[PDB]
Amino acid sequence: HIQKGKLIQPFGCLLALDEKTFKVIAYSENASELLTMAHPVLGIGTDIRSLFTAPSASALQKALGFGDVSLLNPILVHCRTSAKPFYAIIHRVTGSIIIDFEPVKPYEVPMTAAGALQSYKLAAKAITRLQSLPSGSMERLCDTMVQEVFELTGYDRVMAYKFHEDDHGEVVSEVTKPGLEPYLGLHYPATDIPQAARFLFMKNKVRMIVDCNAKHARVLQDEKLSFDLTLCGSTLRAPHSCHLQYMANMDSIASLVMAVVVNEEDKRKRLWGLVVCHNTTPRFVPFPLRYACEFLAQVFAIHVNKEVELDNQMVEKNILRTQTLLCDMLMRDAPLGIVSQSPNIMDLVKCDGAALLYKDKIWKLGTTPSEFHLQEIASWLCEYHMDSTGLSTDSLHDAGFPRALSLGDSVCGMAAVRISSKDMIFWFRSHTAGEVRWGGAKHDPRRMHPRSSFKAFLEVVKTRSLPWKDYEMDAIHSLQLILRNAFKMDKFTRIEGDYKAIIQNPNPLIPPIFGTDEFGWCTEWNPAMSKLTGLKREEVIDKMLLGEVFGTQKSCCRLKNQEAFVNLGIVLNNAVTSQDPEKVSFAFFTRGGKYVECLLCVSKKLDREGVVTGVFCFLQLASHELQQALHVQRLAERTAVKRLKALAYIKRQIRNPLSGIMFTRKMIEGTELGPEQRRILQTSALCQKQLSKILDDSDLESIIEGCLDLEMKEFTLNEVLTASTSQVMMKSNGKSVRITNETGEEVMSDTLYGDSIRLQQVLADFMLMAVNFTPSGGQLTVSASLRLANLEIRLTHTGAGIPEFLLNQMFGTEEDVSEEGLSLMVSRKLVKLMNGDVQYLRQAGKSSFIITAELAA
Amino acid sequence: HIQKGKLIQPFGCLLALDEKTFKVIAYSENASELLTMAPVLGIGTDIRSLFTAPSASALQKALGFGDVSLLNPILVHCRTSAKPFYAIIHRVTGSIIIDFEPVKPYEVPMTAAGALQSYKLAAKAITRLQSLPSGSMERLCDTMVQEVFELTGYDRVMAYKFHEDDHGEVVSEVTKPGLEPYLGLHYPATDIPQAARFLFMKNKVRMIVDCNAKHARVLQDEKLSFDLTLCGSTLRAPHSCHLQYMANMDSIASLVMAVVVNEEDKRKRLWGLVVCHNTTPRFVPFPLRYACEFLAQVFAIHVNKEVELDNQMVEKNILRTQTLLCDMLMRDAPLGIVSQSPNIMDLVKCDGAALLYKDKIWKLGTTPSEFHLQEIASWLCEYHMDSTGLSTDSLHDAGFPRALSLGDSVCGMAAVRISSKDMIFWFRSHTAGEVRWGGAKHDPRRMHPRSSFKAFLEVVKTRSLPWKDYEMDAIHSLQLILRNAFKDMDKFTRIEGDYKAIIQNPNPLIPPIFGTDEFGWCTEWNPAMSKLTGLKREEVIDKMLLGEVFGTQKSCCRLKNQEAFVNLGIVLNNAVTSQDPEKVSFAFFTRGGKYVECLLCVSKKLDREGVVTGVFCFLQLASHELQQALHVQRLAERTAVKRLKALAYIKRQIRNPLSGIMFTRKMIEGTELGPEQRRILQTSALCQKQLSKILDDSDLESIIEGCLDLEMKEFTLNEVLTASTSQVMMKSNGKSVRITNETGEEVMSDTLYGDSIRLQQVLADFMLMAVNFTPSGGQLTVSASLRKLANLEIRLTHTGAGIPEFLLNQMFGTEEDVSEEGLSLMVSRKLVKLMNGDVQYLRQAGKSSFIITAELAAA
């Protein structure tokens, strides 16, 4: 049924011919009407040449003679009768060649695309905008991809549908033109899409259905041999009745499904998901557009695959940071030092609280329960856990604890380790919320018919909190080893999904470490270094590290050349002089002849009284890609050291006279006067505070990304409107343009809660260019209305209006952005942060700005 | 021939030991007095009896070591007197030689006792050398010479450098004030005997303490069957001829350091020397002359990375020439070669160009007369028929009868013949070649050194720069292009070998080229691409370029993976719309396992009617280092653009509220104003005006260089002083600092003719940091004196210890970071210097004074 089925959609015709005789043997029922109806009859034994013109016949013959027909697929042919062009898509199967003919609509791309490259040309804008995006954001990539698919196809309600590890699908993004229901975040069972279709989407990467209720046309074979004739590869295949019923229940009758195949992991291609478009009315799309979409999907898959590895780099970067911090704590003494100094045990692993139980004393910091609660915790640990030195229970409620209920919500995520019989360490986490809105019946790992489970659902969780990862437990184990060694097996459990007795042994995380005397003799050579190099601590000790241990000839470890020797000496001397570790590239040859290339971090050793008593160094074995990225960043950043200095200088030289006007205004406000210039003083102080808070902002990218912090406080609309109008009265009077305020007294005197400074900035800039783009003698009317408080702001200014290129700039659809356009985008992003939008309206002689803001009243 | 020398310098002692039994077999006459005096030193004496047991214990360890050079300088005390000495040990064939040098009481304790402690003394010089941006050799040489000057402390330091003919040329020099410069002089190759050049590759540091000093004898053992070599010892005496040469140069002490670079065949090569000269006897401890052997090694490393950066400029020039040749490949006949924006003058570096086409002349710059062009063509035809191109550095030496008529305008010419009569000329102007050549002339025993180093000059005849090897290749490529285009070996002569005409053979520079029509089929596949890939043209043409020729399977050239296929399609489609030649990374496999990695450049094939007919692509075979450098530059440009936009953001959002403050101030002026409120109003106006001017400035480097145009106006000192004070008294109240003024009323009432904004900014900054450094409850007094042109002197005296000297050094402009405070200090000092003044810092017990001097106009 999904595989074969002598039924095809009726918007095209099909013809299956033999490999050698080039004679028709399978023909669709509607082929005669579509092709030869103004003559040979389309019956078994008819040729393909008779019913087509000489150039069309020659082109078809050449295409059939071609080896890889997948390149020149859209072969625009002409009927033997008057015109009637047809696209002539071609597929090959074992023993047969199937040609699908589709009518060519003259009003849309006639002869524009007749090959793979011309078809691919139709997605250039989408491809270049996908490429132009910055890296590091998967959700941004998905949103852009679905938005471009929606714009290019002309459908509605396009959606990205991602497959999880259990094959249950989840909607990730969506874009719809009207105000229909948003399908976003809903989860669907893994049985919605059968394994047959999922495997069939490995090939036939684009599937199209035009009408649900269209009467399918039968395809009749020949009664002679070669009964095998499969229609899986054809673009005219009748969808299965079950999916037909499902789509009918889903108030859609058209569909265009494109598979996303990520070619990563060790072929081994995996179906990441689908880009599904659903239409409530019949829709047809020319083949070049559907071939341009099978190319955009490949580009999207490439970008997703390349984002996965950028995500992967962060884990190893965090591991390197943890190793550095572990060495830092190794350089200290006593259990008091891990918590006393700045980088504490709260920084070893992400958490919300830390506790140390040392000799019947508690050192706690962060979100921790009461001391007696920890005492009962330790009593239960020493009463029921003797076989393990630790554990990681994500939910203390799930594990056995009589008093877990009364502990609270900010607890029950634990990681505990016993340094000794009594003295132990605890890491505590709070609760993390999480819920799902399953779109139907949960799969809970056919002739089933439709079920109409496209309604709603809700599932919640509890204080189970975030899971504890593996390298985190490795870090805690390494800290335990360090503390135990400093004082003078290691099996502990894990309780994740209430399954008891999950015993696992982790591995230490200590990096290779070596250390030299002040003269140069080698003193410290830890087992990790012995494993990495192959040497033994006994045979490398009381020797010169520069020249004997590391040397170009007759040395245990061989440096490549003399430049490495010079650089090693330079970094040793600099580290004895300079402060804090310096990372340098370091490469050598092992005893067995294997090249090793890592990073070296060196730092001075210290005694109890001042003097430097040697050098302590360790190696970071970063991966090759991280090393290249760090090297490129280091090389490139050497040319950019002046920009921050200039920025700081400008900030200082603006802050000084800003304080000067602060001080003069302090005098002016100090002396008592009448009301009007006191009001002017208040407005000037408000504008000057706006200037000051604009100054302290550091980076623009925070505003662009829409993550800027908001200061919430009281204000009134009258003062903000007056300040904004005052900021541009001078420019309004420069062009003699009158500005009027039609806001009512009730709205004007309203008291609201929000960020008045940003609102004043936005309104002042809008009024500013409204004055700019209003011809002299014109009028600009600003009105405000209040309706959770919704502030509606109308700016109606006379004149022709702002040119449309600036409009496409402010909407963010144009990459070429001017400084004015910079002001526009910043303003629009801030308005979006304020739960609103900025709109532009053009009428005869009047251009009007719509501003919508959300404020608390 | 120095192995026979048996004479040593008298500043130390030399002691030889037999390799087997560690007994004395050679002692200098100086050793008996230097060490023993407070047993008789003879043959076979036990070395242990010479020094104390704690001191002698380190010795046997040192001789027992494998590579003793890692622990050479050993502090040793004698057995009885316990006088400190530095011992340096080295090994000769069948013997161990030790040199003992007295330890000067400059620093008798601590110091260095190994090869790594001594290296520490050059850390500052190494850091300064490493912090220098790359690109120029002159900066490196001057920095190296300056650091040597600072470290050693000799009178003169020079960076003598060898040329190909082994003749030297001083490249840099930094001397004590006075004396006599030597920069630019050239010296004969006979000043450095080959023996010294060979010896320096083994002993990289050589010291002479006194040319005229009483020497000592080695007193070799009679029982030795071999002569004791003294070449490697640091106490070896030099040659008498070289002593006389030092006497002629008016120098006594000397400390030379060889520079050895690694030239790929790796082979050592003596790049040059670093020579230190002193007019008086001088002594330097061993650790310093071991930190100089390390600094020289670092300098040699850095002087071989400014040679690879010069092998990349040539490759970049080759790539640019190839791009320009491809540009001329698609053009309409001749007369578009000359008229269009890139012309023949951009092909090779020349001063003039000319084209002779069908008895007509086209010119593009400094060229001789048209009749002179016809005469040149006639002479070249009547004298050279078996050559299609010629290159002469000098036309007079070439044999041109009328070369003297041209004069200084043209000296060198490169010409090619596209047709029988039609030709192309590049003319390069005459340049002057002058060499100072001090001393004597260089032209390829008991000889005594010359007594005079007179600087007699040398000058060459009428000559220009020589035509390089690849310039002829570019000209030949243009010749081939025009020859092929006209239809629809060659034996170029290059007379510069000084042996009349020598005939060479050039090779073209044309890069691999291919091209497709609008449907994707291959249409152009040039021989260079065939050589690069191995595919003959007839095996490729009329095939789908993307999918059949370049594909991931069953294709002529195999791409690596699917991403390359997608990227190639994307580039081929984007080239039709963008039209720009876009360099993209390309990589493919040839017929046999060759992973070619190059740069693809694609451009459309727009025709006369304005309709495209395919694409035209060519590769650019570039080395990995050049590709990485281009990638790094491209990465940095985006960051620069982003930072520029980010900086441009803030100015508008500061200016708009500023405009608000201005409008409110005008409305305040419109309303009622009191007497003192009026004064506060003008102070606020002045301060906000200063803010407006400082914000509206866009280029700080304009002020830094000195191109800032000050706003000439009229003002008074009292108003500027009040405006500058009002900016800082908030911090004065923050630290409870009391500000006082002692200026006379006449100066306040005096009218000043100048810029008040800059003076106000400078004064505000000065009192700001003066209050910052003033302790709580302190005093800050301002005194202004005006003398009538009116000279103004301002004294700012504040309580406290004082501003640290590093801030003053940053003010004077002697630091890199400088810091916000230091940079503001430097800017204020430069602005005062524009007023022909300076900022002075005076320190007294509990007092610190800023002194500012300036001049203005008065009426």
Ligand SMILES: *[C@@H](C)[C@H]1/C(=C/c2[nH]c(/C=C3N=C(/C=C4\NC(=O)C(C=C)=C4C)C(C)=C\3CCC(=O)O)c(CCC(=O)O)c2C)NC(=O)[C@@H]1C
């Ligand atoms: C006499 C036979 C000729 C001669 C002999 C000679 N020269 C050397 C060694 C050196 N000559 C040096 C020359 C220079 N140093 C300078 O200051 C300048 C110019 C400003 C020059 C040209 C230098 C340096 C050396 C290296 C040794 C050193 O101690 O500096 C020797 C070898 C001596 C030894 O150590 O055995 C000899 C035999 N040089 C001459 O120019 C005269 C004509």
Ligand SMILES: *[C@H](C)[C@H]1/C(=C/c2[nH]c(/C=C3N=C(/C=C4\NC(=O)C(C=C)=C4C)C(C)=C\3CCC(=O)O)c(CCC(=O)O)c2C)NC(=O)[C@@H]1C
């Ligand atoms: C029948 C009782 C079961 C069933 C069968 C079935 N489904 C398909 C194909 C598809 N199912 C799709 C599902 C979704 N699309 C959406 O919009 C969402 C969620 C938002 C879901 C879950 C899609 C898409 C397809 C592919 C359509 C296509 O044209 O390729 C098939 C294969 C039909 C075919 O013609 O190959 C079959 C047999 N699906 C069910 O939900 C029930 C349980």
